[PDB]
Amino acid sequence: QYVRIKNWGSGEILHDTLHHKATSDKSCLGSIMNPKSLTRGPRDKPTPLEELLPHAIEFINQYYGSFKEAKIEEHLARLEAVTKEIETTGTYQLTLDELIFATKMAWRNAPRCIGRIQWSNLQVFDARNCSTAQEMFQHICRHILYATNNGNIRSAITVFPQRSDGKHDFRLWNSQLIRYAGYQMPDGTIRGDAATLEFTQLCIDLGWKPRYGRFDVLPLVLQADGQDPEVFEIPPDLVLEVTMEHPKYEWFQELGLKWYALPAVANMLLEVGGLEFPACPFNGWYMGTEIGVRDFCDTQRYNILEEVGRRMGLETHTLASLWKDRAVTEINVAVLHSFQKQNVTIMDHHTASESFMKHMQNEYRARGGCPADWIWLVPPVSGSITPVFHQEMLNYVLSPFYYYQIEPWKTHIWQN
Amino acid sequence: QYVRIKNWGSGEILHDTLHHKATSDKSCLGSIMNPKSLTRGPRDKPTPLEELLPHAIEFINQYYGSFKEAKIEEHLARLEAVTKEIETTGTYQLTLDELIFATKMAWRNAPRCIGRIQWSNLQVFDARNCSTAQEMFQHICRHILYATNNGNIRSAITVFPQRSDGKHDFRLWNSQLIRYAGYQMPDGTIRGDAATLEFTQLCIDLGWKPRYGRFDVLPLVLQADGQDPEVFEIPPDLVLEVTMEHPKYEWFQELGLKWYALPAVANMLLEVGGLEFPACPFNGWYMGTEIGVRDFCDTQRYNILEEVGRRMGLETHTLASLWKDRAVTEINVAVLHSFQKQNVTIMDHHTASESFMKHMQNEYRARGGCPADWIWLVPPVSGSITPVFHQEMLNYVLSPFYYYQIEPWKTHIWQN
Ligand code: HEM
Ligand code: HEM
Ligand SMILES: C[C@H](O)[C@H](O)[C@H]1CNc2nc(N)[nH]c(=O)c2N1
Ligand SMILES: C[C@H](O)[C@H](O)[C@H]1CNc2nc(N)[nH]c(=O)c2N1
Ligand SMILES: O=c1[nH]c2cc(Cl)ccc2o1
Ligand SMILES: O=c1[nH]c2cc(Cl)ccc2o1
């Protein structure tokens, strides 16, 4: 009938019925980073018609069923037209409106996103007519420019040509549009973003000139029509950055830290009505903790925690002193302070959490559920201090959906 | 063959093979508080022999297989003796050594416990010969006294008579041995521990005299041999408490806060070799965040966060100011400072996390795995600041195991 869901903070109860529309798929794979269930791999043959048509019809019904004032006439016509297109072409092209609807629903269906209250506010760039890498690059630049909007960040997505037979896939090898390089310096020490070590090397192996700095913006590695990836440097004028300053600690800027203002996922796949889009970069704005906690404090990243500790005069040699808790908060304060001062959009984790709670409440009232991955929705700091922590959630895959993809360099067949 | 497990912090890889010995058991029930899979309900008939014997043999093999220098001779004898006891009595009695081994293994197999590095260090009190509530009370007092040890906390467990036919179950109605009462005051305001509202009332409905205070230690509600529960007040001399003081904020003690030093689970069930023990209270020592973050800062608990905020002179009306992050840390500092000052055992969450990481490493080397519930192992604060956050985990039920039980007052048949 329905799964009961409880919020131990307010005591409120919710009835999840939306999970019934969930898709497919050896203990409980609880904290697995990239599970196969969330990954949509490559293909070497077109989608079997017996599979395509059913999913296509399913989607067309969802699209027309979303309207307040039904359009039965148009609905029936679309159903017939789509079927014919599949019969005569082996696939089908979404109408601009359908695609727009799809991108928003896929975001709406992203269990790991805390910013889904903004789901309906998304600019869509239709690049399904793209043909070359140079063209992809131009589209991406236009995207970055529009999204950055001089600090007033705007959520957007660029949709490239859908997968045909799987041999002509459009793909962005980057994990994110804007990302810093990681260098394995001569003196053994790691420089820049340690998480991009391998990818940085690949860029170098493709002709990119390494600048061996702490914040070197990596180039776009674009794969068009299944062909070999081309390297393109992102024009610096398009990469907006924020220099890190603390409202009280003047020595904070002496750290020489900064970060980009545009968080943009670049390697995911959009699934809709049986169709797959291997290239569809999208972006939103930052939530403070991503930079201050993950990027700056993870040991596998910039690992600046101990340094900020000493500077504060804390007992960095005694864990029980809770110096780490004290340091990380000041870094978070710095990140938020800097973005606000430099007029660049950002939201603290507390405001974000509440916003999601409101969204979830809205989703249950609208469709009886909201797919949520607790492990990702709970901030990397102040866990139980946020309401999301006390909220029971159900994680399930719907459609449309944004899937992970296998690393392109592991399945790509080089032309030369 | 084996499930691959990765630690994104150190990059280390682990091979889990232990999950193959997992037991039994509609989307992914990710953040469910009390799932049925972790609950072992009541019975009205003895364990079917066809089920009992197999589990019994399985356990006896595990027990003897744990020894370094094997005791094949004794092993075979025990196997035969257990079988006969079941044939002639319909069940079997564990030897003291077996039970001791069982309690430690069940703890070792608790996916939600961060303190499992101490698994082998556990005192066992055999109360399987208990008969009356008064006797249960005496055993519990002895437990509390031994465990408290004048602040030098010691982990212990008291094992009551195993379930026979399910109609003569020994049960502790309390969720924890020591817990504060929650009163629904006349002026509408909640007083004490808001989480014990319902249970507090039940105690009152059974003859307990409410003292309407902020920290009133609830009485023991004991059920012996399936009979009606009796109320027993815990002797105050046995309840050690810590008054909350801040190392710098002198106004902190003006808050009049305090907490008990003994964390003891009282309502869980021990499953071993087909046998079930509905009453087996156990305890360890506190990890700071349980008191400072959950008990003191949860809105459904003492909710002292805003109060500590103003006292600090923070912008408690602006979420983005991160006042909550600042306040909660000082409370955590207070809790740790007070326990240490009053010589009462306690461990901060950072030291606890590392300790578990070492344990997990030890478990994979010893038996190729360690059942872990990421959602419970990650501290309520400083999530990603701890190593546990970046460690992938596999959650599964082994045997022996500590299961949850259905609330006794919901299935109990009152005598009069
Ligand atoms: C408007 C502001 C937005 C905010 C503040 C936001 C924030 C977040 C955060 C904090 C995460 C976790 C990232 C990580 O830990 O790696 C996340 C994940 C995600 N978001 Fe959002 N998001 C926003 C917009 C978007 C948009 C526009 C889309 C899609 C059209 C979206 C799709 C997703 C997806 C698919 C994930 C999962 C990525 C992964 O698993 O690596 N988000 N988001
Ligand atoms: C030696 C110190 C110990 C520490 C610091 C420790 C700490 C913890 C913590 C932090 C939790 C989470 C509690 C919550 O959020 O409600 C937990 C859960 C648990 N612990 Fe430990 N523990 C210790 C000893 C023990 C012992 C001696 C046993 C068993 C013999 C044990 C069995 C468990 C079980 C079964 C749970 C789950 C309880 C539940 O799900 O409500 N722990 N422990
Ligand atoms: C192992 C663990 O799943 C991993 O480190 C996680 C958990 N929670 C997360 N939560 C978010 N938001 N983002 C992440 O990258 C992760 N990583
Ligand atoms: C809904 C959610 O599962 C619940 O609030 C949790 C999550 N994580 C937890 N973690 C621990 N250690 N203890 C808890 O009580 C909880 N509760
Ligand atoms: O903080 C953020 N903002 C984000 C926007 C996208 Cl699209 C993904 C992850 C994010 O993390
Ligand atoms: O902090 C703690 N210590 C604990 C000991 C047991 Cl047995 C259970 C939960 C605990 O939480």
UniProtKB/Swiss-Prot annotation, chains A, B:
Heme b binds at residues 113, 404. It comes from the Eukaryota. L-arginine binds at residues 176, 285-286, 290. One of its GO terms (biological process) is regulation of cytokine production involved in inflammatory response. Keywords: Calmodulin-binding, Cytoplasm, FAD, Flavoprotein, FMN, Heme, Iron, Metal-binding, NADP, Oxidoreductase, Phosphoprotein, Ubl conjugation, Zinc. The keyword Aminoacyl-tRNA synthetase does not apply. Its main location: cytoplasm. GO terms for molecular function: arginine binding; calmodulin binding; flavin adenine dinucleotide binding; FMN binding; heme binding; metal ion binding; NADP binding; nitric-oxide synthase activity. (6R)-L-erythro-5,6,7,8-tetrahydrobiopterin binds at residues 31, 294, 375-376, 389. Polyubiquitinated; mediated by SPSB1, SPSB2 and SPSB4, leading to proteasomal degradation. Macrophages. Induction: By treatment with endotoxins or cytokines. Induced by lipopolysaccharides (LPS) in macrophages (in vitro). Expression in the liver oscillates in a circadian manner with peak levels occurring during the late night. GO terms for cellular component: cortical cytoskeleton; cytoplasm; cytosol; perinuclear region of cytoplasm; peroxisome. The keyword NAD does not apply. It is found in: Cytoplasm, Cytosol. Changing residue 130 to R: In strain: NOD/LtJ. Zn(2+) binds at residue 28. Produces nitric oxide (NO) which is a messenger molecule with diverse functions throughout the body. In macrophages, NO mediates tumoricidal and bactericidal actions. Also has nitrosylase activity and mediates cysteine S-nitrosylation of cytoplasmic target proteins such PTGS2/COX2. As component of the iNOS-S100A8/9 transnitrosylase complex involved in the selective inflammatory stimulus-dependent S-nitrosylation of GAPDH implicated in regulation of the GAIT complex activity and probably multiple targets including ANXA5, EZR, MSN and VIM. Homodimer. Interacts with NHERF1. Interacts with GAPDH. Interacts with S100A8 and S100A9 to form the iNOS-S100A8/9 transnitrosylase complex. Interacts with SPSB1, SPSB2 and SPSB4. Interacts with ELOC and CUL5 in the presence of SPSB1 or SPSB2 or SPSB4. Forms a complex with ASL, ASS1 and HSP90AA1; the complex regulates cell-autonomous L-arginine synthesis and citrulline recycling while channeling extracellular L-arginine to nitric oxide synthesis pathway. Belongs to the NOS family. This is Nitric oxide synthase, inducible. The lineage of its organism: Eukaryota, Metazoa, Chordata, Craniata, Vertebrata. The chain holds residues 77 to 497 of 1144 of the full protein.
